[PDB]
Each structure stands twice: as structure tokens, then as C-alpha cells.
Amino acid sequence: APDAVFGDRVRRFQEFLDTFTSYRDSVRSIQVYNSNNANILPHRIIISLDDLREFDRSFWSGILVEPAYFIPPAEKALTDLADSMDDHPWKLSFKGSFGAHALSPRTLTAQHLNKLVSVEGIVTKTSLVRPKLIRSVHYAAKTGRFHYRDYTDATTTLTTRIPTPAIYPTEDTEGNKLTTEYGYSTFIDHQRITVQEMPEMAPAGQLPRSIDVILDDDLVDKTKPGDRVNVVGVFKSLGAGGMNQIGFKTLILGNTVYPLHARSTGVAARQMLTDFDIRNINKLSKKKDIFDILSQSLAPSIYGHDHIKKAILLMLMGGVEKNLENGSHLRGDINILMVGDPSTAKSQLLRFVLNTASLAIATTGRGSSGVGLTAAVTTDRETGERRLEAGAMVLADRGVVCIDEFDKMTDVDRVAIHEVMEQQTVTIAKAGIHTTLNARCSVIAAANPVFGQYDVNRDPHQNIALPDSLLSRFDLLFVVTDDINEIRDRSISEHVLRTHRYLPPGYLEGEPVRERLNLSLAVPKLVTIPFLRKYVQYAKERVIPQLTQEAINVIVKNYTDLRNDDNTKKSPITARTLETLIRLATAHAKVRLSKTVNKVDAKVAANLLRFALL
Amino acid sequence: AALPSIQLPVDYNNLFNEITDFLVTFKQDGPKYMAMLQKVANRELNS
Amino acid sequence: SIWNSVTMFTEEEEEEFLQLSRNPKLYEILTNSIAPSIFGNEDIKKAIVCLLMGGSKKILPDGMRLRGDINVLLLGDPGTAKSQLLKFVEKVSPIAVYTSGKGSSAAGLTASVQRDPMTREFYLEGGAMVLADGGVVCIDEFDKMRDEDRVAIHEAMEQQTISIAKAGITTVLNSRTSVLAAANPIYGRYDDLKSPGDNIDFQTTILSRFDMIFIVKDDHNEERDISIANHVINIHTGNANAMQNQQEENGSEISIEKMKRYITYCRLKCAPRLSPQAAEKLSSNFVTIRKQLLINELESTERSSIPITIRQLEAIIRITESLAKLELSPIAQERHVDEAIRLFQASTMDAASQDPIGG
Amino acid sequence: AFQECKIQELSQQVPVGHIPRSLNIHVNGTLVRSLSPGDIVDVTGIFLPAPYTGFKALKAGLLTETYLEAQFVRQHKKKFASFSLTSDVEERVMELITSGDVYNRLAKSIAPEIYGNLDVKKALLLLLVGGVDKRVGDGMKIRGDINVCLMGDPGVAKSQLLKAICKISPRGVYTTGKGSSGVGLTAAVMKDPVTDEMILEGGALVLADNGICCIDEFDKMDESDRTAIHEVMEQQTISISKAGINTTLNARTSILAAANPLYGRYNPRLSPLDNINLPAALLSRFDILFLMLDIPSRDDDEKLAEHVTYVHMHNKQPDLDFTPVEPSKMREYIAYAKTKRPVMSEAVNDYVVQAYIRLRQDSKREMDSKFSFGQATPRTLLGI
Amino acid sequence: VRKDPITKEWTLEGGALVLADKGVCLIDEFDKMNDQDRTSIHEAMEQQSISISKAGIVTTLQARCSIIAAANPNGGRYNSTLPLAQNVSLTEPILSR
Amino acid sequence: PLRDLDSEHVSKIVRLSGIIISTSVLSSRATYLSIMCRNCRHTTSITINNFNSITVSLPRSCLSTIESESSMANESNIGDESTKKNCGPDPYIIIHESSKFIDQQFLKLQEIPELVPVGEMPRNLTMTCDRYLTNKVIPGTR
């Protein structure tokens, strides 16, 4: 029967939902969607814990401290408003600043039980999504009547109830036999996941701590193993810890699950674009020095190397791939290789690409070997089946892979990369498993000269020492050297000393600067690094240029000319060069946001290739 | 819960002050009840 | 380790160290306290004084990360006492680990990843480079170590991180350590007729990584022998136990825990940024340095064994700031640059023992 | 009658970054023995629940498992065995022939986006059709199926041809050198979850029985893997003598292979066999061996570039006076062709004898000077 | 760190070097060691303490011990026409200790 | 020393030295429990201040009958024609939002690996701690 306290807690949350009206229209929107569009959306909204502090302090403190008394009231209050604006229950989500309830699996203790918490870590394993039976319907052929029953369990209501163990009906109240109507019963899905502390926040050489999260219905398939995640929910004690006859059974009943992005991880980074942002992105295009402004802002601290600055942007945007009715796939990724002297900032260039790209994985020479790049087979304890867990290149699909110290790899891995750089498929034929996986990735790499330093007397085949088959699979092979000089020594020295003296905004000189780990959230003046990602993200999703009848003649001339010319080149010439020219041409048209490839872009591609060749 | 609560149009702290004021104010047309109580003090009244 | 450390200071100790900083000639007291039982090796010791303080860490808005730490190599004959210097640097530094190439008995040299016996999930089992974060790792016998370890050591020494990529886990780790390496020369001893490059049993591009290269030569001379023998024989008598415990109590020597605390303090207190009136001095020095190498190397055909690169300019840059810090200063005058270049010539420009630099 | 099948996702349906998932199918009645491993199908079924089979400690509520009850099976590539000549197969094979020129028409209908290489595609079509198998007497057999090998310099489209020929065949498998090693080729020992029996799981060679096998990067394989290919191409059986196994597998498969020269490019200064890694005895078993070199020619390059750049602009082939036969119609004509057994007379025998005499006389002078991949043998006569 | 067959427990065990602290260690057939044993010997003789990082245990142990060792030359017999370093398979870093 | 332990030292205080090799995960144990009967709805409480054993348990029978407390309570306990209120064999449910908990840990101490008998496996002991002693040490410490 009605409780006064429940009623007042509902009333105050009705007033809260009335004062800040940004949540009512959000509820309106989902009904508008599910009616006008008949992908049915789930019945949920998100609340800010910062708004609650301003509106009411005690109600805020109560959800932080006593969720099991203030959450069902708020949910019922929300359901009432939903049924009000209406011409299936509803549930809430939580965001804002939590404070002392922003914990990790190691610092989460028994004094935080029965409160709402935020937990950080890595997802290590997910289970199979299973149906759960709620209501079952039956039929009696001797009376022409249908009967039903309801089932419930302890992980669906935040407060403790008196158990009702009902049974599965096979028989009528007179004895008539009942047929089970599987299509008329209701089933709701279930999944369980385990979380662990992230490897770069955990103490070195110490065993890790983990926590179990239970998800149901709509939150059931949001993540995969090996992800950075933030979860919010109630830390619940269950059952009796052996007092009917280790301790109590503890787990989190999830309500919010946020994917997070980190360096060298399989979760991509995306940002929400404001119309103001779009206006600047589109304004920048018309000025006909877009390429130079964007190129010089690519790690401006390294000096020169402007053509590699161009090439990295061309790889970051990339062309277009094409599928024919036949069933043929034609590649559209660009790959870069760099050979130079042992103090030419190769690793700074690689690390910058790792920091800026939306999805990137870092590998160093012999570091990754064999299965570590392609895939490996494991066994599942429960079902007993043999499964696959992804290697580096399977994870970096529609992305970039950074290979530092490229020349240190064995031939066995080289033959495996031959298949990824051209067909972009990985084929596995192990005991019982025969499957093909997708790996559509671009590759950037850096290599050391065989003789320590580049020898101008000898020809390239004696300095590089890589097979022609692998060389042809790289679109661009750049060579760089540091010529000892005085003019450039002065110029470089002065600039490098400029850089080494820089105050971050807001410190008195002397004060040490402070380091923090950057965890993201997923959904001629130089341009800011945070804006370059916004530019690229729009430039890939929106523009898909088509080929014109003009520039084909330029490409044809350049390819024919190169193949019937007799200068010693830094790479062999094949049909791969023919396709490379088109990929390069379409990348520049992605830079310009035009719907068609053009002649100026074709000549920029040709100029770049010829500089990198001769 | 298993013991539900209800709301009634009463308040005991509110009426206790009214009881006190009546017992330390009433002078019928020294104060009446406070003279009854002064006789109570000296063991000269039982009810 | 990097978690169980004290980062708050008592007022009396703070006043003690602010009065010790104003000590008129403290440079010489410290240099006296870093291995006072070693005879000679003063240039080596000042290098370690600057080493334990490290350069100024700088994080730039381009995503790029310019490191501050100091790398020193001790190459030379046997029995020069360079091993004891590492064993002392172990004990005078708040975070330290003493390892040999090829790791240790059952401890590795680079991050190792294994699957938990109980849960069967991925955790970091160990690795000296991540265990000694924020400290010093003395790599003895640098000459013999495996290629898989060398490749990771390179990225740890430059970008101060390590990258892991296997079937299950991908991640980038933080390894912010200082390197002090000691290697013996091949052929028993160092032949002066042969370039330093072929006097080492490994590739010559490894040398460009370091900042100061110290070549110690065991030269035979009777007068030095008498003095060193007398030094050793008094230490075994007991004299140095009462010539240290005595002048220790006369402000001509700091102690081992006091020094340790002091280094922790200055490390976690200040960050020197150079004076612009001094920058062009360091810039002109670098060009005059490299001009001579170009002249000599164009005179002949073979290239130099010890190359002067862009990494060695930032060596000067860092060592100026390392000396600027035990002064608790935010800026460094020209005297820091003067001492820095003095020590640089003492350490790195012993490329004068190299064939196409003699001229 | 009961059977239980596992079905897995296609590559083009898996989201970005995830692994493909699986499902269970049940079959009863006269619908058994209709699905075989390695098929792409569309199955009609009724989706029904089953009792839970997981861990008790992880049970929350009335959880259930799912399975599918089969009612009707469709296969995207119809097998050649099923061929029964009805009246609509008559209609379209009767139009195919009325336009004549069938050999060239169906030779250019293999990968119409790859320029040139007509002679390679003519050989490919014959490897798709096959020959005649002869039980000579005493129960001894001659193989009647052709094996083709391709060599060439980088960037000549060999792998695209292998992919295409694996898409056209009803049974056909594509494998790469080191990713399919050991038990991934021959067979493995596993215990059956359903029947509780010890079975042998087939590899690539066992999945392509009565089909075409496509191997890429032939030169990189292990010696153990090469021995099995040797045996399959000679007698079409695989013998295994390891712990727990003494059997002989029946493998009727045709081999298509691709390989690069040892030094990347072909060195005409070096001998023909100095440029190929494989032993000459293996290359003596392939019926036809094609060498696809890349000698720069100014004129031909503008016709190749035209085709490729046209293809990247239009998703169709550039020829308007040629009809590309659909794969289904090609499969029908190939099946009807495979239902015939022609025979040889004496006059045709004379010709073959006479040609063999002259070829055997000429091969020796070439092999003496070290300018041939192989001296003529009886196997060349069998190939002819 | 291994498992005890009897009690079914995980144990920390040191080598003979650790177990013989303030005593003597006797290594027979000193020239046939594998890389692991050689690294352990070098650490013990140089620094006189054993380091381990396994299964969540990070520690340093005391190895103040005396070493006596026996070895056979290369080939089988002694070559007097060459120095010591060229008759035996041990290296100068170890011999000098 | 760890090997000098005998029957004498049982229920007595000892001082010991060693090295840590194991540390388990923190477990939850109750300090204050609130319960209810699933048949009659009687409520009570439990307080625990002795966590050293590794014990209090839940009552086996309803306490409403033995606490014949109210004059109408012993009357609500009757009825249903002729029979005696029988709640059941064990009818107490824990109301978790109204209960409080603490942390408990397990550790293993090992003798110094140096002063060990030659050729024998080192011996170890199992230790229990709670409240303000948890997470104070790591394996590898003496």
C-alpha cells in the first residue's frame, strides 16, 4: 500500500523534472521517433548530478548515499511524465561529477556497499547473451482458453522482497493439458562482464583486482573484451554469506556504461561537431593554401621534413575503395616508409601520428611476432568452443599501424604482412577453425640504413636491402639525410633552443609542470591539434569524390613516362604505382572537400611521387 | 516496506506547547492550576 | 617505488635545506660527498652530481614530449673502479635498481606480460625499466644484451615509454628512467692505434644515444701508484673511517640519508628554464663544434666513429639546467653554460682520440 | 533421423573490429545429409528455446539457450552432381550454343576486369571442365583432372585470378602459404560433442574434394606441407602415420598455385631453374606451367592503364561488344559438359604419336644447354 | 616460485647461492652452464644479492657466499702456448671475480 | 622462529618475523544485520563484534513465539481453525540496504629463505586481518 515517504520523494522529483525542462523534451523525442519511424529506441534518459546539487542538496546526497530509496521514486516519477505527454517502464542514467564515489577496482571497499559508484578499468571478458523468461502463455484445447504466469528474481528490484517461487504450469485448474505458446511469451536478454584495473594505472609487479558487472536488456552488447570503460551502478550484496548453514556475494548492477579511448587501444575517438565548428571547417576550405596550413601544423616542433608532413596527411585522409558486382575488392589505403640517419626524429614523427590519429596501434620491430600481429585461438571454459582473439592488425581496422624499427622483422612476419598490405584479409587454417578476417589498415614504418649511415657512393639496393615484393607494396619510400653544414646548423640550433624555453599558461617560472593520463570520450598561423581531428572526421564521413575524364590523361602520361624512362629509381615500377597515383589524387580531393577529383590534385600527387622517387 | 507509513492531520510537538501554556496561564474569571500544584507540592492534594 | 614515497616536508628540514642551499661553496661539498672513498675521478663525479638531478621535463602543445634525463657511458680498462661508482649511485638515489645486460637471476630488463595463474588474465609481471620509474637504472656489462631488449631500451631511453602489442593486450607504458652504463673494451685493453668504434663489441649508432662519454685509461706511472696504494691501505687500516666521521662534523661533507633526502627535495621542488642572454652562447658553441668535424671529415673519406648529432646539443641544454637546480634557481646565468661546456669537452670531445678527427 | 549443424557469420556482415559469432541448427526427417561443411546457404527454421547449460553460480532467473529447427535449405552455388536435365536447363544451354564461339566466350568470362592473359584463362576453363578418368583394369586408375601453376613478377594479378577461380567453383578453397600449416591441410583428431565419438576434422584439401584448391605464395611453404601436395597431385590420397592415426584420406582435388621468382624479378642472365625455388620434380607434375613476366613495353602499357583506370571510374568492364556470361549459366554449361565422355579413334592416335616423337626429339637439345624448365616426359603426353 | 607436491602450496625458493649464505657454494662442472645459471652466478658474485620479479613477488635476497668451482679446458687437455682466457670457455668478467 | 611453534603457544600471544608471498582479495563480513520473517513479518537485529574466527548464525526458529511480548501478538499467533502457527524450518531474510559490513584479508608468511634446512621445502603459515590493517603490505616485504 502507498507509503508517505515514497509519495513525497516522488513529488519532489516531479518538481525537479519540472524546473529543468531539458529532460522532458528528450523523452518527447523518443516517442516521436518510435511512432514516426513505424529501429525502435530504448526508453531511457540521462540526468546530471550537477543539476541536482543546485536544485536540492539533500536529494543529491541521498542518491549518492541511499540509492535504494531515491531511485525507484525517480523512475516512477519519470514514468508518470512519459505517460502524461503520451497522446513500458522507463529508467535513468547518471553523469556529472561524483567526487569520492569515483573509484577503481582496487580502492573499492566494503564501506561503499549500497551506494552509487563510478569504476574505471579494462573489460577482460564478456559472456553469451541469453534470453530470460518473464511471462509464459498457454492454450487448453478442451476449453479454448489461454493462461499466463509471471516470473521474477532478485536482480531486478533494488529493494529486498519476500521471494515468490512460482512453478511452470503444465496443467489446468481442472486437469486439462496445456500447449506452450513460444511466440506469445515474453523474453528479455542478459549478459555478464568482468572489469579490471587498467595496466597503466596499476602498480607494477602486483596482481590485479577485478569486479563483476551485470547488464540486462538494452545495455547488453555495448562493449568487447579489451576495452577501456567507465561503469556506474549500485554495489550490491546478495544472498546469505553462509549464515544459513568466504563472505557475501558482491557485484554491480549496471545502469551506465561509457566507452573510453586511450593510446594504443581498439576503441576509436569521435567528437560531436557543433554548427559553429562546421562553419570554420567549411570556411577554411575556400582559401587555396589549405594543404600548406594543415601540413605545417603537423608536429611543428620537428624541423623541415615538409614532404613527409604532406604524406602523413595524405595517409590520414586516404582515398576510396570500390566493390564490383563480380565480387572484386580494390584497395584504397596509403602506406609510407621512411629511411634516414640516426638523429632525424623518426620516432617523434611516429609518436605524433600515434597521439593524433583516431585509432592507432604501436609496434616496435621484434616486439610483435607471429600470432601477436594476426590472431590467436583460445578455448572457452563454459561452452568449450575454440574462439579467436584479435591481433594488432585485426584490431586496427579502418585505422593506422605504426611500426618503428621496421628492418628488424623476420621473413615469417613479412610474408604475413604481404597479405595485409595488398588484399587486406587474414586467412587462418588451424585445427577446426577455417575463417577469413578483415584487416583494412594503413601502415607507417621507419627503417635504419644497413651501413649505419646512408652511403651516397653505393646505389640504393645496397643501402636499403629489402625485397622488391615488399617495396612495391609501399606507396612511398622517402629518404632523408642530415648534411653537416653551418647555415642550417645555426638555423636549427636557434629554433631548437626556442622550443626548449616555453612556459605553459599560468605558471610562475620554476614550478614543475604536471603530468596527467589523457582518457578521451567517444560518441602562416598554425591550426590547433584539437581542431585537426575535427577536420579529418568530417572530411572522411562526408566527401566521397568520383573520378573525372580529365585527370586520367595526366595519370596515364606519368605512368607511361616513368615505365619507359631510364633513370635509376628508389623503387620498382608496377601497376601498384598506377593505383597509387589514383589513391594519392583522391586523397587531395578529400582535402579540398570537392565532389570530384581534379587536375591540380593529380599534378600534386605526381609531383610528390616524383620527389620521393628522384 | 513490510511496515508502511501513513500521514495524519495531527502534531504532538505543536499541541504540547499549548498544554504548557494552558497549565502556566489559566487564571479563572495567583493562577488556578499553579495554585493547585502548589498545594500538590506540600502533600495536601492527591488528584 | 613511485607509489610509496613521501611528498610532504617538515618545516625544520625545509629550513635546514634552504640554509644548506645558501652554503657559499656547496658544489664542491657535494662533489666531495658522492663517493668520497674513490681516489681521483672528479670529472666523473661531477657528472653524477648533475645526473641525479636530471633536466627539466617539458610537455609541448604539439603533443610532442621533450624529455629531461641524463645518460652517461663508462667505457674503459678493467679495474678502474667504475663499478663501485654504480654500486654507490644505487644507494645514494631514492629510486634505483642495479642490473646487468641479460637481466638478473629471475628479473627481466624490459616489461614482461604474463597471464594470471588464477584468473588467467594479463598483468605486468616485472621489468627493471618500469619498476624503476622516476629513478636510476645502472646497466653493467652493456656490451652483451639481446636484440629484443636493445630495441625496447632505445625507445625507453628516448621517448620514456614502452609499447606492448600481443594477442590480448595493447598499451603504452611509462618508463621515465636515467641510464648509467659500463662496458669493457674488447681485446683485453684499449689500443690507442684503433678507433673507439672498433674498440666496442656492438654497433656504433648506440653511441649517439648518450650525452657524456667517459673513456678511462689505466696509464702506468709510479707516482700515481704510490698514492693510490697508500689510499687503499689506509681505508683497510681504519683511518678513512675517522677522516670521514671527523670532517663529516665540520660542514665539509653531507651524509648518505641526508644527501638522499636533499636530492629528492630539489627534484620535487624546482624546474630551471635557461636565461636568453645565454642561449646564443650555447648556439654558437654548437656550430663551432660541428664545423671542425666537417672540415676534418671532408679532408679524409671515412666518417667519424663518434658523431656529433642533434641529441648532443640537448645534452648541453639539459646539463645547464641540472646545475641550475641545486641553486633552487629558475634561471641560469652564463656560468652554468661555462661549466657545462667545460664538462662537455672533458666528456664527449675525447673524440680527439679518433682517427679522422685528429687535425 | 537427427543431425546438428553449426553456422558462422560471413565476413561482410561482421562489424568493424569484432569477431564472427555462431549458432546451432537442428535437422529431422528426410532433410538430413543436405548440408555439408564449407557451404554458403540460406536456412529456413523455427527459433525455439532449450534448457540452460551454463554454470549454476552464474544463473540469475529463468535463462534459456536457443536453437533453430530446419525446414528448407537453399545453396547459393548448385553442385554438379545434382544436375538433371529438365526443360529450362534445355532452354538456356540451347541459347548459349546458338550464338557459337563458346570457348572464347567463356574464356573471356573469367574475371572480365583483369586485362589480357587470354591463354591463361583458356587453360583455366579447361581446368574447370576436366577430363576422363580410366579404370584401366585390375582396379587401377588414371586421374582425368588437370593441375595448373602460375609464376610471374609482382603486380600481374595472379592472386586476383586465384580469388576469382575459387568464387566460380561450386567447391573451392583459398589458402595462403604459412597461415595454413600442419593439421590445417590434412586432418585432425577431435571428439564429437553430440555423438560422443572420435572424428577426423578435414583441412583445406579435404574440404575441396571434387573441387579446386587455390594456394598462394607456393614457394614459402614447409617441406612437410609440400610432400602432401606432391602425393595429392600424383595419386589423390593422403597417408598419415602419426600417434593415434593410421589411415588414408580420399582427396580428389585439382591444384592451382602461384609463386614469385626467387629474386623477386626474373634474371634472364640466370638459368630458368635458378630463378624458381621449387624443385623441378614438382614442376614436372603440373600439366601446364605459365610464366608471367613483366617486360616494359611502351605501347601495351597505355592499353593496360586504360582498362584499370576505366574500371576505377566505372564499376563495369570496358567492352560494349561482348556479353559476360553469368556465373550460374557458366556452372550449368560446365555441368552438362561434365556429363559427357568422348572417346579416341585410331586416326587421332596417329597424330598424337607423331607429335610426341618430335617433341621428345626437341626437348633434349634445350635441356642440354640449360634453357628449359623440363625435359619432355610421358606425363606431357598424358596432359595432351 | 613453484608448487609444493605435498601441501599444494606456492613457495619461494632460492638457489644454492641464497641457501648457502655465510658459507660456501660448490659448483661442479663449471664450464657447462646454460645462460640462466651464468646470469645468476654473475649477479651473485658481482653484487652479492639475488633479485626476483615473479608472480607478484619483488624482492632482493642476500648471497654473501664463497664460491669454489671446477672446470675442464676446451678440447680436453691444457694448451700452454696460449693464455688462460683462450683455454677455457668462461669470460674475463667472470674470471676476474 | 616459525619452526619453534608447538602446543604450548595455543591461545597465547607470539612475535614472529618473515616474508610475505600471498595477499588475497578483500572479503565482505557483516557487523550489523537486520532481518525479517517471510511468513509472519517479525523484525529484529544482530550485532557482531568478533570477526576473528576463520561464528554467529541466523536464528533457526521465529522469535515471535518465544517473545510472547504483546497481548494481541499471542492472539495473532493462533487461529486457522485448530493448529499452531508454524513459520517453517529457517525463515529469516537479510535486508541488505539496512546492514553494515567490513573488510577481511588472508596472508601467508614464509620463513626467511636463507636459514632453511638443506633440501626441504620452506614452511608457511596462514594469517587473518581486518578493518584498519588491510592493504598495509605487499608481497616481497619482511
Ligand SMILES: Nc1ncnc2c1ncn2[C@@H]1O[C@H](COP(=O)(O)OP(=O)(O)O)[C@@H](O)[C@H]1O
Ligand atoms: N629535424 C629535427 N628537428 C628537431 N628536433 C630534432 C630533429 N631531428 C632530431 N631531433 C631531436 O633529436 C632527438 C632525436 O631522437 P630520435 O627521435 O630517437 O631520433 P631517430 O629516431 O632518428 O633515431 C629528439 O630529441 C628530437 O626531438
Ligand SMILES: Nc1ncnc2c1ncn2[C@@H]1O[C@H](COP(=O)(O)OP(=O)(O)O)[C@@H](O)[C@H]1O
Ligand atoms: N682508485 C681507487 N680507489 C679506491 N679503491 C679502488 C680504486 N681502484 C680500485 N679500487 C678497488 O679495487 C677494486 C676495483 O674493481 P671494480 O670496482 O670491480 O672495478 P671495475 O669496474 O673496473 O671492474 C674495488 O674493490 C675497489 O674498491
Ligand SMILES: Nc1ncnc2c1ncn2[C@@H]1O[C@H](COP(=O)(O)OP(=O)(O)O)[C@@H](O)[C@H]1O
Ligand atoms: N593486368 C592487370 N589488370 C588489372 N589489374 C591488375 C593487373 N595487374 C595487376 N593489377 C592490379 O594490381 C594489383 C596486383 O595485386 P596481386 O594480384 O597480388 O599481384 P601479384 O599476384 O603479382 O602479387 C591488384 O590490385 C590488381 O587488381
Ligand SMILES: [Mg+2]
Ligand atoms: Mg630511433
Ligand SMILES: [Mg+2]
Ligand atoms: Mg666493474
Ligand SMILES: [Mg+2]
Ligand atoms: Mg601475390
Ligand SMILES: [Zn+2]
Ligand atoms: Zn515467523
